[PDB]
């Protein structure tokens, strides 16, 4: 009704002052974005919200557009805008809202979150370390390191100990336990054998990226296993309408032998007789199953639960990292508010800060006892600064050169004050340590070039781009001269013998896409390039004559 | 080469079909070397080389290596104009809704999903999940869920539940959508949804669904997945002086997209939480939005400045856009301007071109001549010759220029006479010399104006200038056929001084033998130029079948009358020069010469008139002195009487006998009346003088005073400015329009003191401030009109329709203010004109009513002729030459082809510039009233009409309005009206009224006049009103032009009975289409659909154009383009503005034959 | 590289260089016309691979390539005055020329 009255009063008036809109727009609205959207829609209506009343002639002259589909759409938006009050358009307001939804963290809470992340990654550690091919490939990595295909510190960052000698002794102890456990699954204590092997390894430590590689190895292993499960069951569940109970009673529990499928065609059921035409692909799937059972160190189901416990640890630690990042988003915003006017928008600063804060959260250790802020503030501010130095100028200056520009500005801002008028570049190079040419090029580095739509202005309302000329064009007089010279060259070569003409057309690039060379020319004339040189020289001497090249003389410009 | 433009939504795959490579890095150039980067917006692999036939690094530097792709940088060696053509693309890491199909008002995504705009925006900016095919689980498709609600609904539902939020949500809503299936369900509901809003929006939606089906578009293409990249040379980063660069704003927006997209890929690869990735997606959304159309979100992101960046939608729209002043208004070569001077010796067909401008413009022609004649060996030698400006470049200039027109154009081209082809006459100096009789067309005085000369380059353009625009072809105003070659001020004063007798000059009452002897007598000084003599005159009268019989007699004329008779051609009578010959006498002299003899004798006559006027005006010696302002002696007597009257009225007012404002009115009236007496006294003192005489007695004759001779010859001035010069100045206004009641009792022969000179400043500054701002928007009415009447062209020779308006005189209460012969001249009759004897076919039919037929018509006193109108032409997509008339710019009939719509727009706009710029009420006037007239706005107080015919009857009493019903003599009366009792009626309830008749009184809304009475009624209404204004100020413009504008106005039809046709009922259709449709459907065994004719104001009618390349010019480019994309429209060009834009001939002028032959091919 | 204010200008043929003194600048006292070289400046550039028949032209006349543009300051067109004055400004790095 209210805003409806406003719309109808405008549409009968043909205009609207800011005052009338203010009187008629609702009173719940506090921000100016909903108010400006209302003004935009109402102008689209359209009624042209103004500041002052229009003249009597400005009503008649002002063109009226454009009914009326947009009329209906605008009215149906305006009738609804008055109801929902919290509506907003800025991504920053939405971000601040959905970040204020979380509750801040406390010191002991940060200790809890750090220890929980450590527990999750430690569970992942144990699940991976209970994979024997993992330690086998790790010993192979260290061996190919010992063959100097890598570094004794590159492959892994030492162990949980501070010299590589004790490390290599740990390697030898690991190899001894490995030989005493791996060829000794003769199961009663080989369980505790591989337990002890993984335990003695757990004091060790590898580079993170190699450990991620091991993670992906186990991932692909379990994935091929479960995809054998997929092609098996989906070709029994949907290709044979298999009740899952038969699956759980045959497949689960053993999961390896051919009793649950290859002894599953004698179940005295119709789908069991269907399973013949699905016995080939599922039979090969059991083949890959048993092959990977050999390729697991144990059965398929045990490695299933191993990678499962790994996944449990990974999900726990990931949710923990998430909770820490959610808590400290406010810290990231507080830091990013310091850089808001150096070329990058506010949300971009916050996003770079969030990436850096994730990186710091991955590196936090509460064994020391410092505040999380005191550590992560470093990574946050570095992330934001590199972001501004990398993606704030249109023409990208490398980071170190931008540090040099900041230093130049600092020293100049100091020296002009202390020295009087201004520092001449010799004076800066003296005060600085630079060689005074580097300083001059640093000065010459352009800055934030300009919008080519800049006014000129007021002469014709022509932006700057109208006066920047194209210097790559062959102006029509130039092309005319070019083709005139082309025709003249043709009509000169007409006055040469066939040999001279061919050798001069081919030795130069006339009417062919080369630029033939002397050997390739004299191939067609059977000369060893010396007589061909002589023939070129004779033709050039002949055309050199006046009364044969007066026109070609005129083509010379000087 | 194309014959049509097509448009559609761009598929992601097709956007990769255009691309030459995916831009990944944000960088532009190297900052040190300035080389393009490997994946930046300015790449060499993606967008091609930087120098011609030369790879980036430089391994391949031969044109023989053409087309091969280098190995060290992958930059294929081509021409670097290829870099102005190649697009790239950006693989968006998240779908991002295209802002045009979302934030446009109807919101094609919203009205296509059948979803509210705010709801989609909530799903899009990550407020609320949306159900996207949630199975059978009681979930509602397109039902929003909130965050907490989505969680708890997922509780108890581990099953899919298929809910998504973000742009991917809208993309999965559109992709899943079945369009024909929804068309089927909406047809089935439109079957049984017979209520207005429901079935209304049903049909309004099924229209867009069927359209999306036909256009080939897929609904989900409005969600961008790939993003195309404008090529580098359309958004350069060029260096300015001193290491300085200048970029486009487009590079900034592009970098913003690339950065945020790369960061989003990073966030996804880093497994960040939901808050961060959601916020990154929102940011990418706003970045892509700002890139496409900066400002629809709010707020327009600003650069390294306070102002917003310019974007793609900005790169097309706005007067700084492509359509406005790069698609029509272009800078042109072979052209140049200078400062015009008189050059009064030229003929009407030539212009003095300076030798230096002529040697610059005609450069290639001169080079060709020097190398053709052998004077220059090659083009370089000719270049050096004409650079030195040797002695033979001048002979070559004379030869080249010889028959080669130049177009002269002055800045406000209000009409087509602001461009004329002239033959160049080489002159010294640097000023263009412009003929005197051409300034009226150009609106050019010689106090510093400048003219632009362009050079026609082709034979076809040389023949278009010579045959069409040559200055001796255009001599009649295209708005009204009166000649536009009227001699202006020295000419008319010459012809007035010479053709103006006095009572006793030298040689009175000699009988000369003829004009030769009168001239020989005057030039030897034996007789004076105005000395009444009997002279023997032989005049030739074509009183015959064009036979030109001679007749000699003995007239009584002055010596100058007969000296001037020597220049007048044969067919003209002798009474044409036997009077004083002021201004109108000369214009009518040229006019009768044109109506008798045609164009060649009239051009010759015009030149001879200018020559003799200037010669005998110089011999006139007509100076201007201070003793020429004869202040009347009875001026201070009259002012004493008026001052006494104001003193008496002030004494009565002081005694309470009058009020204050009453006495103000009285004193303003007293001063206006005394001013009238002083002006009358001074002009009666100035307009006559005493002189002696044959017999010796004093005798009064018209004064030879110079100020009066200039005001009375019509040469310059008038008795009002004369009054300000010697009479008193009068009362002066203020800017408000009030009148300062302290008059200016002084003149300019006397002085004004400081106070009166201050008081005059008020009105002076007001008038100048208005004239300075009228100059700003000088051509807005012309532009508004050429928006709607542009595509109208004379395309046919005869339509055959017998419809026609009845042209008759306009009797404005008393006498006629415009006779029938004037309103009817040039029109083609629609039926046989019977003699007043009512059995004699006076003018049979289809007879171009020229001056012979028009005189025959006024002679018989036949005063109502049925003429064919442009508004009643049965032609489709055009007008015929018979329903149009004659040209009025050329005496003949219109040619098949002539673009009469643009002629009509300019013929109404240019004459409108002589009207007041602000509306004044007396019948209002001024230009704004005319613009409102053509906008067909509804008057607030409509005199209500009688919608149906029958017995009048009333009804209920005062339900707000007194109610009435009209009930037919035999028919039904379902129409009743809520007549306001404020609308004080005109007819009692007991007088049966015919349909279409007045009920109340007041302004008649033209819509109701059109709907009640014929289209002829609305057209006569509009022409009579607008011509009321144009005659109010005294301006003459024909009715043909208003009629063609109106025919552009009422060009929409609304269908009542859809018949056996294929038209929806409550639909508006281009009337020219529905006409052919019902004609065809009635051709076969069907019946046509009957419609109600509509009417639209010009700004509303021009918004409904069949094309979209044209409609994106004068409209909002964004809405028009969004609509055309979702409609899959194709522009088969067929227009003027579209063919201008796309760069081929228009179908209007000489291009008509080209388009006819092309239509022959396309139909073969 | 840098550009020089030299008088050893490309193709222009020892008449346009008549006004210029040794350092390349016009004399204070000369009356130039439109086109005359006030300050002769030669700019560095690359080769740019002159097309054949230009290769053949310069091979027949032996007039080898310049490598240096003639981007000098010549009087605008239509003006014809006396050169009443000449000021020179050399940055502190650039040494100076004879006219300076
Ligand atoms: C005319 C225009 C005003 C627009 C209102 C102003 C605004 C920005 C100005 C340019 C920039 O400063 C860059 C550069 C700096 C150099 O040192 C001197 C040259 C340059 C090209 C300047 C010329 C001119 O002065 C510009 C175009
Ligand atoms: C005449 C015009 C003002 C008109 C109002 C003046 C004022 C500053 C001038 C520009 C600057 O010099 C910068 C730049 C230098 C390049 O080298 C040539 C182009 C530029 C854009 C110049 C063209 C023009 O000359 C400008 C716009
Ligand atoms: Mg002027
Ligand atoms: Zn290369
Ligand atoms: Zn017709």
TrEMBL record, chain A:
Keyword Cytoplasm annotated: yes
Leader sequence segment: none
Binding sites annotated in the UniProt record for Mg(2+): 550, 553
CDD domains noted in UniProt: Sigma70_r4
Motif position, Interaction with polymerase core subunit RpoC: 348-351
Residue segments, region Sigma-70 factor domain-3: 403-479
Keywords: Cytoplasm, DNA-binding, Metal-binding, Sigma factor, Transcription, Transcription regulation
Location of region: Sigma-70 factor domain-2: 324-394
Subcellular location: Cytoplasm
HAMAP family referenced in this protein's UniProt entry, alphabetically: Sigma70_RpoD_SigA
Family classification: Belongs to the sigma-70 factor family. RpoD/SigA subfamily.
Oligomer status and interactors: Interacts transiently with the RNA polymerase catalytic core.
Name assigned to this protein: RNA polymerase sigma factor RpoD
Organism: Escherichia coli
């Amino acid at each position: 009704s209210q805003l409806k009255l406003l719309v109808t009063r405008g549409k009968e008036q043909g205009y609207l002052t800011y005052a009338e809109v203010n009187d008629h727009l609702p009173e719940d609205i506090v921000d100016s974005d909903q108010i400006e959207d209302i003004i935009q829609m109402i102008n689209d209506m359209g009624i042209q919200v103004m500041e002052e009343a229009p003249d009597a002639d400005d009503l008649m002259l002002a063109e009226n557009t454009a009914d009326e589909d947009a009329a209906e759409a605008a009215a149906q938006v305006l009738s609804s805008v008055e109801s929902e009050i919290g509506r907003t358009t800025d991504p920053v307001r939405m971000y601040m809202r959905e970040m204020g939804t979380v509750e801040l963290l406390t010191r002991e809470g940060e200790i809890d979150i750090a220890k929980r992340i450590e527990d999750g990654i430690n569970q992942v550690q144990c699940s991976v370390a209970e994979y024997p091919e993992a330690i086998t490939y790790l010993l192979e990595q260290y061996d190919r390191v010992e063959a100097e295909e890598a570094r004794l510190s590159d492959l892994i960052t030492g162990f949980v100990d501070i010299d590589p000698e004790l490390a290599r002794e740990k390697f030898a102890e690991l190899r001894a336990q490995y030989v005493v456990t791996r060829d000794t699954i003769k199961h009663a204590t080989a369980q505790e054998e591989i337990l002890k092997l993984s335990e003695v390894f757990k004091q060790f430590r590898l580079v993170p990226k190699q450990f991620d590689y091991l993670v992906n190895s186990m991932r692909v292993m379990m994935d091929r296993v479960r995809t054998q499960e997929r092609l098996i069951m989906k070709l029994c569940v949907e290709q044979c309408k298999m009740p899952k109970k038969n699956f759980i009673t045959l497949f689960t529990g053993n999961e390896t032998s051919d009793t649950w499928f290859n002894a599953a065609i004698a179940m005295n059921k119709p789908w069991s007789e269907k399973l013949h035409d699905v016995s080939e692909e599922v039979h090969r799937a059991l083949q890959k199953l048993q092959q990977i059972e050999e390729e697991t160190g144990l059965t398929i189901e045990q490695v299933k639960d191993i990678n499962r416990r790994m996944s449990i640890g990974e999900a726990k630690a990931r949710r923990a990292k998430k909770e820490m990042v959610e808590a400290n988003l406010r810290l990231v915003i507080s830091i990013a508010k310091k850089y808001t006017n150096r070329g990058l928008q506010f949300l971009d600063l916050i996003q770079e800060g969030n990436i850096g804060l994730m990186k710091a959260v991955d590196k936090f250790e509460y064994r020391r006892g410092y505040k999380f802020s005191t550590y992560a503030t470093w990574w946050i501010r570095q992330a934001i600064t590199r972001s501004i130095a990398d993606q704030a100028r249109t023409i990208r200056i490398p980071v170190h050169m931008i540090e040099t520009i900041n230093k130049l500005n600092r020293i100049s801002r100091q020296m002009l004050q202390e020295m009087g008028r201004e520092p001449t570049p010799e004076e800066l190079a003296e005060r600085m340590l630079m060689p005074e040419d580097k300083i001059r090029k640093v000065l010459k580095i352009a800055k934030e070039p300009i919008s080519m739509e800049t006014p000129i202005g007021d002469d014709e309302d022509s932006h700057l781009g109208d006066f920047i000329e194209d210097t790559t064009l062959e102006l029509p007089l130039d092309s005319a001269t070019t083709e005139s010279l082309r025709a003249a060259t043709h009509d000169v070569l007409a006055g040469l013998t066939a040999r001279e003409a061919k050798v001069l057309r081919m030795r130069f690039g006339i009417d062919m896409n080369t630029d033939y060379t002397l050997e390739e020319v004299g191939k067609q004339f059977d000369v060893t390039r010396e007589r061909i040189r002589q023939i070129e020289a004779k033709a050039l001497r002949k055309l050199r004559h006046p009364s044969r090249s007066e026109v070609l003389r005129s083509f010379l410009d000087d | 080469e194309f014959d049509a433009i097509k448009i559609a939504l761009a598929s992601p795959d097709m956007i990769r079909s255009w691309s030459f490579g995916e831009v990944k890095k944000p960088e532009t150039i190297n900052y040190r070397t300035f080389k393009p980067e490997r994946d930046g917006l300015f790449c060499a692999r993606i967008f091609g080389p930087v120098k011609d036939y030369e790879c980036l690094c430089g391994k391949y530097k031969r044109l023989k290596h053409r087309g091969v792709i280098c190995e060290k940088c992958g930059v294929e060696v081509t021409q670097t104009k290829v870099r102005r053509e190649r697009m790239g693309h950006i693989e968006l890491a998240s779908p991002t809704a295209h802002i045009w199909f979302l934030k446009s008002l109807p919101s094609r995504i919203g009205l296509l999903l059948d979803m509210p705009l705010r709801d989609i925006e909530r799903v899009l900016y990550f407020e609320s999940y949306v159900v996207i095919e949630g199975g059978m689980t009681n979930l509602e498709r397109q039902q929003i869920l909130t965050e907490e609600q989505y969680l708890d609904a997922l509780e108890e539902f581990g099953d899919e539940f298929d809910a998504k939020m973000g742009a991917e949500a809208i993309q999965a809503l559109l992709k899943s959508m079945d369009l024909e299936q929804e068309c089927e369900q909406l047809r089935e509901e439109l079957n049984e949804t017979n209520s207005e809003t429901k079935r209304k929006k049903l049909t309004k939606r099924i229209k867009l669904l069927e359209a999306f089906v036909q256009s080939g578009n897929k609904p989900e293409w409005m969600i961008l997945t790939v993003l195309p990249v404008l090529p580098p040379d359309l958004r350069p980063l060029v260096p300015l002086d001193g290491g300085r660069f200048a970029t486009s704003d487009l590079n900034d927006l592009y970098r913003r997209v690339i950065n945020r997209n790369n960061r989003l890929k990073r966030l996804l690869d880093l497994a960040a939480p939901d808050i961060i990735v959601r916020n990154e997606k929102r940011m990418l959304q706003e970045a892509v939005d700002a890139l496409l159309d900066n400002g629809r979100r709010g707020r327009a992101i600003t650069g390294s400045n306070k102002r917003p960046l310019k974007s793609l939608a900005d790169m097309i729209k706005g007067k700084q856009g492509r359509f406005r002043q790069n698609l029509l208004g272009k800078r042109v070569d072979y052209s140049g301007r200078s400062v015009i001077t008189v050059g009064p010796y030229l003929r009407l067909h030539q212009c003095g071109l300076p030798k230096k401008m002529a040697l610059e413009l005609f450069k290639p022609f001169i080079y060709g001549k020097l190398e053709l004649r052998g004077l220059a060996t090659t083009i370089k030698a000719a270049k050096k010759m004409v650079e030195r400006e040797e002695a033979v470049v001048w002979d070559i200039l004379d030869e080249v220029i010889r028959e080669h027109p130049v177009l002269l154009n002055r800045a406000p081209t209000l009409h087509r006479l602001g461009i004329q082809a002239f033959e160049p006459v080489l002159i010294e100096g640097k000023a263009i010399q412009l003929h005197p009789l051409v300034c009226a067309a150009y609106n050019a005085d010689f106090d510093g104006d400048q003219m632009a000369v362009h050079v026609p380059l082709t034979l076809e353009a040389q023949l278009e200038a010579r045959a069409l625009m040559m200055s001796t072809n255009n001599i009649l105003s295209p708005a009204n056929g009166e000649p536009i070659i009227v001699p202006s001020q020295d000419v008319v004063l010459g012809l007035y001084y010479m053709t103006r007798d006095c009572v006793n000059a030298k040689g009175e009452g000699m009988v000369l033998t003829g004009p030769k002897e009168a001239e020989r007598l005057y030039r030897s000084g034996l007789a004076s130029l105005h000395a009444r003599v009997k002279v023997r005159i032989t005049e030739y009268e074509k009183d015959a079948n064009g036979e030109l019989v001679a007749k000699t007699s003995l007239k009584d004329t002055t010596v100058g009358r007969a000296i001037l008779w020597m220049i007048v051609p044969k067919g003209l009578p002798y009474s044409i020069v036997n009077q004083a010959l002021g201004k109108k006498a000369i214009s009518k002299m040229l006019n009768t010469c044109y109506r008798i003899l045609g164009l060649k004798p009239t051009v010759i006559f015009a030149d001879q008139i200018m020559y003799t006027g200037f010669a005998y005006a110089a011999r006139s010696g007509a100076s201007v002195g201070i003793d020429d302002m004869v202040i009347p002696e009875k001026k201070h007597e009259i002012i004493s009487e008026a001052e006494a009257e104001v003193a008496e009225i002030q004494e009565q007012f002081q005694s309470g006998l009058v009020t204050a404002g009453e006495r103000y009115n009285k004193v303003i009236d007293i001063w206006a009346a005394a001013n009238d007496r002083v002006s009358k006294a001074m002009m009666d003192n100035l307009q006559t003088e005493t002189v002696i005489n044959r017999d010796g007695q004093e005798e009064k004759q018209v004064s030879f005073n110079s100020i009066y001779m200039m005001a009375d010859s019509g040469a310059r001035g008038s008795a009002a400015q004369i009054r300000q010069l010697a009479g008193m100045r009068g009362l002066m206004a203020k800017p408000d329009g009030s009148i300062i009641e302290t008059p200016i009792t002084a003149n300019f022969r006397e002085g004004l003191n400081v106070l009166q000179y201050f008081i005059s400043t008020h009105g002076a500054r007001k008038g100048l401030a208005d004239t300075a701002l009228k100059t700003a928007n000088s051509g807005y009415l012309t532009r508004r009109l050429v928006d709607v009447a542009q595509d109208l062209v004379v395309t046919e020779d005869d339509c055959g329709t017998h419809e026609g308006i009845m042209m008759t005189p306009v009797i404005e209460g008393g006498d006629v203010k415009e006779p029938l012969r004037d309103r009817v001249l040039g029109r083609v009759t629609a039926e046989d004109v019977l003699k007043p004897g009512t059995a004699d076919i006076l003018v049979p039919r289809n007879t171009l009513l020229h001056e012979q037929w028009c005189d025959l018509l006024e002679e018989n006193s036949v005063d109502a002729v049925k003429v064919r109108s442009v508004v009643s032409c049965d032609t489709d997509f055009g007008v015929c030459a018979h329903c149009y008339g004659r040209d009025l710019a050329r005496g003949h009939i219109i040619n098949k082809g002539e673009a009469i719509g643009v002629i009509a727009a300019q013929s109404i706009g240019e004459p409108g510039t002589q009207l007041t710029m602000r509306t004044f009420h007396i019948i209002t006037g001024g230009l704004p009233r005319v613009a409102d007239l053509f906008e067909a706005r509804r008057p607030k107080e409509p005199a209500i009409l009688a919608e149906i015919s029958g017995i009048v009857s009333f009804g209920k009493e005062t339900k707000g309005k007194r109610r009435l019903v009209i009930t037919p003599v035999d028919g039904s009366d379902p129409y009743e009206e809520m007549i306001p009792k404020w609308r004080q009626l005109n007819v009692f309830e007991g007088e049966r009224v015919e349909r279409g008749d007045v009920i109340s009184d007041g302004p008649e809304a033209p819509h109701d006049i059109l709907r009640l009475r014929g289209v002829h009624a609305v057209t006569r209404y509009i022409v009579n009103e607008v011509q009321d204004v144009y005659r109010l100020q005294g301006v003459k413009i024909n009715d043909k032009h208003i009629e063609v504008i109106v025919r552009q106005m009422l060009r929409k039809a609304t269908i009542v009975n859809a018949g056996s046709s294929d038209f929806l009922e409550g639909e508006q259709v281009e009337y020219s289409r529905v006409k052919i449709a019902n004609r065809e459907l009635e051709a076969n065994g069907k019946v046509g659909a009957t419609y109600s004719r509509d009417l639209l104001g010009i700004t509303k009618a021009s918004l409904a154009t069949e094309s979209f390349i044209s409609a994106a010019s004068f409209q909002e480019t964004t809405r028009v383009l969004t609509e055309a994309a979702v409609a899959g429209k194709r522009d088969e060009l067929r227009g003027l503005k579209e063919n201008v834009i796309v760069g081929r001939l228009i179908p209007a002028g000489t291009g008509y034959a080209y388009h006819q032959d092309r239509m022959r091919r396309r139909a073969a | 590289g840098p550009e020089e204010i030299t008088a050893d200008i490309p193709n222009v043929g020892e008449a346009a260089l008549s006004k210029l003194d040794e350092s390349g600048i016009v004399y204070i006292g000369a009356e130039v016309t439109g086109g005359d070289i006030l300050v002769g400046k030669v700019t560095p550039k690359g080769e740019t691979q002159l097309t054949p028949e230009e290769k053949l032209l310069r091979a027949i006349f032996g007039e080898k390539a310049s490598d240096v543009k003639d981007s000098s300051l010549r009087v605008p067109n239509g003006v014809s005055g006396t050169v009443i004055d000449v000021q020179v400004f050399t940055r502190d790095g650039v040494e100076k020329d004879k006219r300076a």
